[PDB]
Amino acid sequence: MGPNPMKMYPIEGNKSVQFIKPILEKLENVEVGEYSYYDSKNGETFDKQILYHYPILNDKLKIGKFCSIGPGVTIIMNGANHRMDGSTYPFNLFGNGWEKHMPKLDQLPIKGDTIIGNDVWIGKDVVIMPGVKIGDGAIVAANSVVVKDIAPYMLAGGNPANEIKQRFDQDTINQLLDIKWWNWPIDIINENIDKILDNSIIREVI
Amino acid sequence: MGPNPMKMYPIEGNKSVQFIKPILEKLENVEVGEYSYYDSKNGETFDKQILYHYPILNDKLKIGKFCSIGPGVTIIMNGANHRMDGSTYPFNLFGNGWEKHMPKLDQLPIKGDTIIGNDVWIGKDVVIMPGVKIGDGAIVAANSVVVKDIAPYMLAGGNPANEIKQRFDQDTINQLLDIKWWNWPIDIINENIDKILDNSIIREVI
Amino acid sequence: MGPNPMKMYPIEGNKSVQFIKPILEKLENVEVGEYSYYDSKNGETFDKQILYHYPILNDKLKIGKFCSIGPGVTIIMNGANHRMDGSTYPFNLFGNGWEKHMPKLDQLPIKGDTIIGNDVWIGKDVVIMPGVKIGDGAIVAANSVVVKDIAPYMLAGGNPANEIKQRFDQDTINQLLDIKWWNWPIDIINENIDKILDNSIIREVI
């Protein structure tokens, strides 16, 4: 029961809502969760929303399951970082003799992997910068620029995005994070969808 | 004197500046003032700048008059709000049995109606969140993102938008809010445009 | 050695990277440095990215040499400010009797000239508001909105863009702002690029 997580377009007669996993599986250094989707802005596939991702830099991108990704959301990897221990001017890019000043792999600044948890909701037109971690159950307001990590089940927003409030009490969150329902076989998930939708799944699996 | 507020494109040989009332009056749950205009960013009509507005949720949008709306400005209504008591994932959206969990009106959160006063200037590419109230005579800096209420004759800007300073002394502000020149028949306003443009209408009228 | 700074497109066959100077020199009230380049977003020339710049307001825009400007960057000039001693509504624009209310120049508020220093890196989609000064060697994070001045060799980001941290210890900057390698005859720079790239320039030249 439920859509086919392997269908590029789960909804019939609908080419706006897509399933990420199928689109990104062909890619290197990219891990995506089963039912995470992206609601297309102008009909573009999500792979077009991932910028500056070169295998050589070996920075990875991980997205969990059951994530809701709004249109225009942009993931920036480490491909565009300019060497910064000195001048940030890329002389090497203009040939004519300057090619010999090509940076050294270990000379380029890498902030790390970008990791997005499970059950995350990212508003539309959100820009996520390199080396950012977003915990499970988190909500990122639209038009946000995420520069630093985001604690699980936190509600964040702004440019630079800050944590505004905690979705639930410390306790519950602790429970949910321990339970990890998105990690259950779908047959089960499928029978508690309503409890998952009202957070009671805690009072029964405890 | 002045153009006819009922004319969609008030200026001759200029299909870019448009009076909004005529355009939006043709919409459910929308109230627009008389001389409020919208400066097109690429030709599009303002009705296309209002997103996620579904009559079924019954959230209304109202805009005073003599509002200067910059290009690319965006208004987000309650149509994109995800259920949050538990998981934010839209199961119901994917059908195939999950339709079952379609959320109940009283379950989706509505922040209220969005209200934009009179004589308000909103910079270009400003994004306005749902359920927000903006005061009369306020100035909203370009590229801002309004998430909370803004008081009258306030200057605000940022993401999130914060109040930065007051435009005039409380005295003056207290007066304009009292006179509401924007509520006079235009034959009258017409012979005080200068006293309105220099804030002196406070010494004559009062 | 190095590319011809008078070339719009210094990289054969590439219409994406373009030198700003040979492009904007034809304009008035615009000063640009020799090797400052622009990384086109959709192939558009940098001149399309400078808005509301009218020679009658006489506000000037300055950019030094060796600046790296990412795609989408937007420079907003003063031709967009509204009178604000009273109503912000542009009565004059609609004519038909109201033109009489055209504002005199000393009534229009002007923040001033926009000056971007040398060896400055501005990330993608940054919007630079009117009358700002960005010091030498600064770095502005992508998706920033510059409302105020930015000291030299400072890393800034946000909306409003706020200084985050000093790129280097004062000692270095003080010497860096002194050496002014960007002003050296090209051939002298041609022999110290490596030194400039790792900041070892301070040691020798000083």
UniProtKB/Swiss-Prot annotation, chains A, B, C:
**Where on the tree of life does the source sit, at the highest rank?**
Bacteria
Keyword Transferase present in the record's keywords: the answer is yes
InterPro entries reported in the protein's UniProt record: Hexapep, Hexapep_transf_CS, Trans_hexapeptide_repeat, Trimer_LpxA-like_sf
Tell me the keywords, alphabetical order: Acyltransferase, Antibiotic resistance, Repeat, Transferase
> What does the record list as GO biological process?
response to antibiotic
The EC number(s) this enzyme carries: 2.3.1.-
Q: Where is the active site?
A: 82
Q: Name one GO molecular function term.
A: acyltransferase activity
Question: Pfam family of this protein, just one?
Answer: Hexapep
Tell me the enzyme class.
transferase
Record CDD domains:
LbH_XAT (cd03349)
Assigned protein family: Belongs to the transferase hexapeptide repeat family.
Q: What does this protein do?
A: Inactivates the A compounds of streptogramin antibiotics by acetylation, thus providing resistance to these antibiotics.
Subunit structure, interactors included: Homohexamer.
This protein is called what? Streptogramin A acetyltransferase
Q: Which gene encodes it?
A: vatD
